[PDB]
Amino acid sequence: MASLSRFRGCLAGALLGDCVGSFYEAHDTVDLTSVLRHVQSLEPDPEALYYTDDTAMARALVQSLLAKEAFDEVDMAHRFAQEYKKDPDRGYGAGVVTVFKKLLNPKCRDVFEPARAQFNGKGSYGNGGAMRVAGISLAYSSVQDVQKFARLSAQLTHASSLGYNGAILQALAVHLALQGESSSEHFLKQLLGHMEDLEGDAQSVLDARELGMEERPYSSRLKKIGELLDQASVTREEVVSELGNGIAAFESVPTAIYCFLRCMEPDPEIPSAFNSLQRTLIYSISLGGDTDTIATMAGAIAGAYYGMDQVPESWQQSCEGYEETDILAQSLHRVFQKS
Ligand SMILES: [Mg+2]
Ligand SMILES: [Mg+2]
């Protein structure tokens, strides 16, 4: 499979995760049968599903990378802010809105200061850095640039290492996804090596200990994925208890990744006519909690790995702006991949 296909699959899967997972975000628990009914209603026979903050930001991040042919924090920050100002009602978290509103100040002149000031200088560790980061791994091909620019992109709104390290991790998973066919063993191992190295930094260790998490929390969770995957049958309750399904990056980014890995194999609960990308998005949503973001992150990874061949037209064409999202992928491929 060729890499425009992976680029297109990445962004479309992210878009599907948002658009479809967003239906379940206010739900207590999620009924699997209801998710199955809903995705089946996308097919037939004989109204778009709206995207939210997660795709709005992912797009504005891509657009910045395209306009500058590189990461440029002043441009990206301004695009984030203007996209909010244009369409403020996409469903942004309250915390991120305070940052945008500071960014829209004429007297703001350090774009990283607003984010840094949040939670009394601790910064946010929510998943909003990670929800939008996929573009970084489509623009930057070296693992080093991916880490660097995923951190700085996240830092525009999420100044906590617990936040930006999750963005890094999600950027690395999509990066490794772009290399295609792997064992889940090999895939996790590579992710672990990177996060064990990142979480040894003194800032990451202070931030974890201050939160009272004792440290290397992304590394700890990547090891738990390891044991979940090698357990015969693991229930949703057990996944959510070990990994999380919440808004914090550490409760969502690893979960998105177990969903990707687990769903590489069939599941008798999910009709066997659904392909692996499909299964991933269904399974991701069925865990509840922060369904729009977990599924958009899991869709990003799945899409990069499986490509547009597993993105059905009926699903894709149900989503608001699926046409702009294909253009975004084609432009990124041309601007960054073709050379
Ligand atoms: Mg959302
Ligand atoms: Mg969300």
From Swiss-Prot:
Q: What is the name listed in the Swiss-Prot or TrEMBL entry for this protein?
A: ADP-ribosylhydrolase ARH3
Q: Which cofactor does it need?
A: Mg(2+)
Q: What is the effect of changing Y125L?
A: No effect on hydrolase activity
Organism encoding this protein: Homo sapiens
Q: What is the protein's quaternary organization?
A: Monomer.
Q: Where is this site: Glutamate flap?
A: E25
**UniProt effect for mutating S153L:** In CONDSIAS; uncertain significance
> For binding Mg(2+) 2, which residues are annotated in this chain's numbering?
E25, D54, D290, D292, T293
Instruction: Report the subcellular localization.
Output: Nucleus; Cytoplasm; Chromosome; Mitochondrion matrix
Instruction: Tell me the impact of changing S124A.
Output: Complete loss of activity. Abolished recruitment to DNA lesion regions following DNA damage. Abolished ability to hydrolyze proteins ADP-ribosylated on serine
Key words of the record: Chromosome, Cytoplasm, Disease variant, DNA damage, DNA repair, Hydrolase, Magnesium, Metal-binding, Mitochondrion, Neurodegeneration, Nucleus, Phosphoprotein
The outcome of changing F119L is: Abolishes hydrolase activity
BP terms from Gene Ontology: base-excision repair, gap-filling; cellular response to superoxide; DNA repair; negative regulation of necroptotic process; peptidyl-serine ADP-deribosylation
Q: Where does substrate bind?
A: D53, K122, G123, S124, Y125, G126, N127, G128, H158, L211, I247
* Upper taxonomic lineage: Eukaryota, Metazoa, Chordata, Craniata, Vertebrata
Q: Which catalytic reaction applies to this protein?
A: [(1''->2')-ADP-alpha-D-ribose](n) + H2O = [(1''->2')-ADP-alpha-D-ribose](n-1) + ADP-D-ribose; 1''-O-acetyl-ADP-alpha-D-ribose + H2O = ADP-D-ribose + acetate + H(+); O-(ADP-D-ribosyl)-L-seryl-[protein] + H2O = ADP-D-ribose + L-seryl-[protein]; alpha-NAD(+) + H2O = ADP-D-ribose + nicotinamide + H(+)
